[PDB]
Design a protein around this ligand. Structure first.
Ligand SMILES: Nc1ncnc2c1ncn2[C@@H]1O[C@H](COP(=O)(O)OP(=O)(O)OP(O)(O)=S)[C@@H](O)[C@H]1O
Ligand SMILES: Nc1ncnc2c1ncn2[C@@H]1O[C@H](COP(=O)(O)OP(=O)(O)OP(O)(O)=S)[C@@H](O)[C@H]1O
Ligand SMILES: Nc1ncnc2c1ncn2[C@@H]1O[C@H](COP(=O)(O)OP(=O)(O)OP(O)(O)=S)[C@@H](O)[C@H]1O
Ligand SMILES: [Mg+2]
Ligand SMILES: [Mg+2]
Ligand SMILES: [Mg+2]
Ligand SMILES: [Zn+2]
Ligand SMILES: [Zn+2]
Lengths: 460, 550, 196
């Protein structure tokens, strides 16, 4: 039957991004030997993957689409349908199953036709998302209220959508709207989760709101003890950037969130799921470092290969079911040479992440404008989820007052109340995200929101 | 798996060298400190492949109380770029840490070819890493570097220069005495039968290395198992112990194992080997016997009269005469007399090694004979050097070619003080240039005539020393009738007569006669045929009258 | 292990040359300054292998009050790509710093074969590094470059051209007079008998 890339379906953004070359058109350059409708070696339009263009624009890696249009010819294109080669290959560092050479499975049998290859941890030449647009500082300033009251760290989940980021060519931006937090037992240097219980529920809110789990955020905010918000400069050049337990644990969640792709052999490639670490700069102000594991770093967690050390910069190679061949990493020495060092038993963790930029809009107009809810799983600071706030939050005993539901924490609490049905809550999350007046007037005339009135006109 | 002195055998003289070179500076560095000389840190082993060169390393190394640091050839070359040269630096720092230290490097040519004849700069770095780190050592380190190869010529000679490697130690092919000892090493672990005569085996094995002998021991063991395969069922998971106790290797298994693919030794090189023929085995020609007793035995026995008389001898002896006159055996019997070492070199052996271009070995013929002084160098079939260009008539090219021009250098490149001797022999002496017959090169010229009937008597006495001949055999009546027949012809008659005897022996078995009858002879005597024309002799007798006109 | 003039013997005429070529410009650069000629900075040693060519270097070098720098041929060729040419640049800057300076290079042919007869461009760079850095020197530096080999023909001749290496100095095989002196050098440390 068909290919996966003949049955999988891209995102609408991936539908938007395919119809563009992303080519950067030069005008008549230096060594033009032509009239103005001629060309020379120096007035061609440019590439999205052009390294001199990425160097002058200080752009670290090309986008995954700029990677896509680099590695593939234009003719090899899925609108052919049947005759299409997916240029992307999701890594398969597990074990060649169903081996066609007479020997048993991987277990009990091995030959050359079933073994995977030894890993060359180069830097990944591309990344998925380039910019991390936090849609409001009030998204953050709400979120960092737990740390200012306690001082211990905080984990969250990035919600939102992926849009075009036009500053870099073919840039995808992680527009961030919302954060939900599962039950968890919080400590200082590490965090261990409790299992998340309403897994279909909060995901249904994003399905209502038109959001999804677009990534993960957590914090590394250790106040440096001078009372301003300065940190111990701990995530920088000399120390490290990513804790290696954070790398594996995010790659656990990143394996839980791949992205379907019409350009890859499984019909899926990479991951929409991204990673952010809130920290502090050298200047003593609350900064953010955004990353994502490489497609090897996902696979070596999927194929159970690497392991953290006591040194956060060193990553251990696991000793011996499975198959652990060489790992390398290409270097640049002090005269530019590329030396693949033996990564057994340990190696730098540099070759596993990609760097991302991060920021804000010029003026905050997110899909959420309201902030009225005490955050879940904080009964250790007395910040709980009770029904009694809705008399002041949605203002239902003050029955004239308009709709303050523009709050994802509260929208999940309304979804925790689970009163509005699947069409009326998608009429709520219609009005909770778009705020139409005649549709608020429709929702204030719907039965279930008037049921949500008349139930909460009789509470205390 | 851990090697003592007893585990190696036969090459005692070579081990006598290495104990002076390796055992001696380590357990007593004070001796070189007391005498005030530098200990040699340049021990180099070489020889044919598979000759215990790796084995003799640990045979010395495990018999010290010194630290040892093993270093293989292809193991470094297996490594990646830069990292391979790191391990050499990682080698010597540990040895200069643990200062009584032994560094053995097996297969040194793999990490050190010629820098002229190589392609990768990674090879050129690791040579350059080695040349650097050899010189970075100290005499106070008291660290000995050992290296072994099977191709001593493929090495970059900058190692073989002074300060880096000075002690060229060759491991030659052992004698039947020493290889007897080698058989006893492998068979003392083995379970044999009482019929096993290793001395009979060691006599019957002539050009084998110990690897050939170890394969020889392993081969006859398998045939012993092949005899037991009827009593052994392979579907069984464990055979019983009664066939294990009866599993004792017979002498005939080695008789089987001597006629197997095992025999194919490594003998296709320029070898040095003591001969076996003697003066009694060459009948007649006692005049030129004494001439060799004059010309070559007096210098190897008494150089004292020369310095008494202030005169260096003639080192160049040329044998000549008609073909088939035993001229090959003459140099062997005289090296067997005065116990000098012997190197047999034939004509096409020069040429066939020069289609593969082995001419440093031609120099190394003189060098190994210089290493094995006293030694005689025997050049068989000098007409073949002329026949490289057909002859002196030939393809209009004479005897002179690239072979002669090499040999005239190497013959003149010999110190007259050295007792290393060069023996030339041809049967076509007119067809050789006088440039090789030049005084200083080859000035003694010895005609080898046919024997008389008394010589033909003495040959037939000497040839039939190991044959169960009849009692009625009048060899003199044979010697009366054999007149123009060479010594090769007389042996050819016996090969006919034994074949005539086997045409009675196994004929009678199919129709033990261990006697060679007159009826076996008078058939071959009627079938006897002369191989040398007398008009050819009248040439040689005119040369025997006068070749000095040239 | 530190070599004076007495430790070498026999090749007196050759040492008479080098003292005119190396000892003379260093302890008296004024002589070439007074006569107004350029000091030769192109001292080249050559001869058969194992003839004291490395030995006569320190026999001159330790008998100056000048700075000395040592370069081995295979030591540079042992190094990685780019880093090997760095050490040559690190060599001459120290010598042009400590201006009375002696640069001896043992086994010059290993870092400088013929550019026609070579394969690696890394060899061709380090030759090209050498040809560059020889010309980058100055007469005011008062720095003498010594080089020794056993194969004077295998060298790229662009070194042996003018300005880079002009002073071809051969070390011949000594006479029985001079090699008698060489025996006395080695045996005066030795303990002998009176019959010797
Ligand atoms: N002369 C010998 N005496 C005893 N055992 C020997 C002798 N020669 C070879 N052997 C055996 O055969 C093996 C061959 O290994 P080596 O001769 O030491 O290797 P090699 O001589 O360096 O030649 P290679 O390995 O082919 S380059 C030895 O390890 C012994 O087991
Ligand atoms: N006088 C002799 N005494 C003993 N054996 C002899 C005598 N003459 C010839 N032979 C035998 O003849 C064979 C050949 O000996 P060679 O020295 O090779 O003969 P040659 O004179 O060298 O001429 P060719 O071309 O080599 S056969 C050997 O088997 C010798 O034993
Ligand atoms: N003429 C000499 N006088 C005294 N000692 C000498 C003489 N020639 C050689 N030697 C000794 O032998 C050693 C050989 O070192 P060098 O001759 O200087 O090396 P080389 O001449 O550069 O030839 P290499 O190193 O093989 S390229 C010297 O260090 C001395 O110990
Ligand atoms: Mg070996
Ligand atoms: Mg012959
Ligand atoms: Mg030298
Ligand atoms: Zn143009
Ligand atoms: Zn397989």
């Amino acid at each position: 039957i068909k290919n996966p890339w003949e049955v999988v379906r891209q995102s609408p953004l991936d539908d938007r991004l395919d119809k563009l070359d992303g080519k950067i058109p030069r005008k008549r350059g230096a060594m033009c030997r032509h009239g103005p409708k001629g060309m020379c070696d120096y007035c061609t339009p440019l590439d999205p993957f052009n390294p001199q263009y990425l160097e002058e624009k200080k752009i670290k890696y090309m986008s995954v689409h700029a990677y896509m249009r680099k590695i593939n010819s234009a003719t090899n294109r899925p609108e052919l349908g049947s005759s299409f080669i997916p240029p992307l290959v999701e890594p398969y560092y597990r074990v060649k199953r169903d081996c066609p050479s007479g020997h048993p499975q991987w277990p009990e049998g091995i030959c050359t036709k079933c073994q995977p290859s030894a890993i060359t941890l180069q830097p990944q030449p591309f990344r998925m998302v380039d910019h991390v647009e936090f849609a409001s500082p009030q998204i953050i300033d709400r979120f960092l209220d737990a740390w200012r009251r306690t001082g211990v760290q905080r984990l969250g989940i990035l919600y939102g959508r992926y849009l075009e980021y036009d500053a870099v060519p073919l840039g995808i931006k992680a527009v961030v709207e919302a954060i939900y937090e599962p039950p968890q037992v919080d400590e200082i240097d590490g965090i261990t989760l409790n299992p998340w219980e309403n897994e279909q529920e909060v995901n249904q809110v994003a399905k209502y709101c038109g959001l999804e789990q677009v990534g993960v955020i957590w914090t590394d905010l250790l106040d440096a003890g001078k009372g301003d918000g300065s940190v111990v400069c701990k995530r920088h050049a000399d120390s490290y950037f990513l804790a290696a337990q954070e790398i594996v644990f995010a790659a656990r969640l990143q394996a839980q969130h791949p992205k379907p792709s019409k350009w890859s052999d499984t019909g899926r490639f990479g991951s929409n799921f991204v990673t952010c670490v809130v920290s502090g700069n050298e200047q003593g102000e609350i900064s953010i470092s955004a990353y994502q594991m490489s497609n090897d770093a996902v696979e070596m967690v999927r194929a159970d290969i690497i392991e953290p050390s006591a040194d956060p910069t060193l990553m251990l190679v696991r000793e011996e079911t499975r198959y652990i061949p060489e790992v390398f990493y290409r270097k640049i020495n002090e005269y530019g040479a590329n030396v693949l060092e033996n990564a057994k038993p340990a190696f730098p963790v540099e070759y596993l992440f990609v760097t991302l930029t991060h920021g804000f809009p010029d003026s905050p107009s997110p899909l959420f404008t309201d902030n009225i809810f005490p955050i879940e799983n904080r009964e250790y600071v007395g910040e709980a989820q009770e029904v009694s706030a809705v008399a002041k939050a949605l203002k239902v005993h003050e029955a004239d007052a308009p709709m303050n539901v523009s709050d994802f924490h509260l929208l999940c609490f309304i979804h925790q109340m689970s009163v509005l049905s699947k069409e009326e809550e998608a009429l709520l999350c219609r009005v909770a995200t778009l705020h139409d007046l005649a549709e608020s007037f429709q929702l204030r005339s719907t039965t279930g929101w008037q049921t949500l009135h008349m139930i909460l006109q009789s509470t205390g | 798996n851990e090697v003592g002195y007893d585990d190696i055998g036969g090459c005692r003289k070579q081990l006598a060298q290495i104990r002076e070179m390796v055992e001696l500076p380590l357990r007593h560095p004070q001796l070189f400190k007391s005498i005030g000389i530098k200990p040699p840190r340049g021990v180099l082993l070489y020889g044919p492949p598979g000759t215990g060169k790796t084995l003799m390393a640990r045979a010395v190394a495990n018999e010290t109380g010194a630290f040892f640091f093993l270093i293989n050839g292809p193991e470094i070359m297996s490594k990646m770029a830069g990292e391979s040269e790191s391990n050499l630096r990682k080698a010597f720092e540990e040895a200069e840490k643990n200062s009584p230290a032994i560094i053995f490097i097996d297969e040194i040519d793999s990490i050190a070819p010629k820098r002229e004849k190589t392609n990768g700069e990674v090879e050129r770095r690791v040579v350059s890493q080695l040349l650097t780190l050899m010189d970075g050592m100290k005499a106070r380190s008291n660290v000995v570097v050992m290296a072994a190869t099977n191709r001593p010529n493929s090495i970059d000679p900058a190692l073989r220069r002074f300060g880096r490697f000075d002690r060229e130690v060759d491991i030659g092919i052992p004698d039947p005495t020493g290889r007897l000892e080698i058989l006893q090493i492998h068979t003392k672990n083995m379970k044999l039968a009482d019929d096993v005569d290793l001395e009979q085996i060691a006599a019957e094995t002539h050009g084998y290395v110990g690897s050939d002998l170890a394969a020889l021991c392993s081969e006859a063991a398998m045939q012993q198992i092949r005899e037991k395969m009827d009593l052994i069922d392979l579907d069984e998971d464990t055979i019983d112990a009664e066939v294990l106790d009866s599993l004792g290797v017979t002498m005939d298994n080695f008789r089987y194992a001597l006629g197997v693919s095992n025999p194919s030794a490594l003998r296709e090189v320029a070898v040095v080997e003591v001969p076996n023929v003697r003066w009694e085995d060459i009948g007649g020609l006692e005049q030129v016997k004494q001439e060799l007793k004059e010309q070559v035995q007096y210098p190897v026995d008494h150089p004292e009269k020369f310095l008494k008389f202030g005169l260096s001898p003639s080192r160049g002896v040329l044998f000549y005469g008609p073909p088939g006159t035993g001229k090959t055996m003459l140099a062997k019997a005289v090296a067997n007399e005065c116990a000098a070492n012997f190197i047999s070199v034939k004509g096409p052996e020069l040429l066939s090694m020069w289609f593969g271009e082995s001419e440093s070995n031609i120099r190394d013929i003189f060098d190994k004979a210089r290493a094995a002084a006293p030694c005689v160098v025997f050049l068989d079939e000098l007409d073949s050097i002329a026949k490289a260009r057909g002859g002196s008539i030939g393809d209009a090219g004479g005897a002179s070619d690239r072979v002669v021009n090499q040999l005239l250098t190497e013959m003149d490149g010999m110190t007259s003080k050295k007792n290393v001797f060069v023996i030339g022999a041809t049967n076509r002496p007119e067809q050789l240039d006088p440039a090789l017959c030049r005084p200083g090169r080859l000035d003694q010229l010895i005609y080898v005539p046919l024997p008389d009937e008394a010589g033909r008597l003495s040959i037939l006495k000497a040839q039939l020393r190991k044959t169960p001949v009849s009692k009625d055999v009048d060899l003199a009546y044979i010697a009366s009738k054999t007149h123009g027949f060479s010594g090769a012809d007389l042996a050819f008659i016996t090969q006919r007569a034994v074949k005539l005897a086997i045409k009675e022996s196994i004929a009678a078995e199919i129709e033990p006669v261990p006697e060679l009858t007159k009826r076996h002879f008078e058939e071959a005597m009627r079938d006897a045929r002369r191989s040398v024309s007398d008009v050819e002799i009248r040439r040689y007798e005119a040369f025997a009258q006068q070749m000095k006109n040239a």
